[PDB]
Amino acid sequence: GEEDIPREPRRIVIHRGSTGLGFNIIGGEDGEGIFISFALAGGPADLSGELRKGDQILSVNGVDLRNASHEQAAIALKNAGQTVTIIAQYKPEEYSRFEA
């Protein structure tokens, strides 16, 4: 299950369409990281097969989010336009500190 999920960074392009990107993030203050916290069934992120709960979002449209606050990352995603290029890396241990 978890073992075979690729741990390298990946570049994923999704389109916003008329639906939203189809995922939520969690984060905190600068340095806490930005993680996918929820994936909407049938949304763009889900349909990609390439994004999941526990992925750290490293960048959006080339902008580094490794040290972004939650609000900073959320504004970046909201303003990323109709085509959103995400670099994500699967970080289940770090994400486990946010997920109850």
Distance of CA 32 to the CA centre of its chain: 14
Helix (H, G, I), strand (E, B) or coil at 65: coil
Q: Using alpha carbons, select from 79, 60, 73, 63 the residue that is nearest to residue 32.
A: 73
Q: Are 25 and 37 in contact (CB under 8 A)?
A: yes
Query: In sequence order, what DSSP letters do the residues of 1-64 get, joined into one string?
Result: --TTS--S-EEEEEE-TTT--SEEEE--STTS--EEEEE-TTSHHHHHTS--TTEEEEEETTEE
Q: Going from the N-terminus, what domains does the chain have, and what CATH number goes with each?
A: 1-100 (2.30.42.10)
Q: Using alpha carbons, select from 51, 67, 71 the residue that is nearest to residue 59.
A: 67
- State which approach was used to obtain the coordinates: X-ray
Helix (H, G, I), strand (E, B) or coil at 71: helix
CB atoms within 10 A of CB 15: 13
Backbone angles phi, psi at 39, to 5 degrees: -125, 120
Give residues preceding each break in the chain, C–N over 2.5 A. Answer: none
CA separation for the pair 23, 27 (Å, rounded):
14
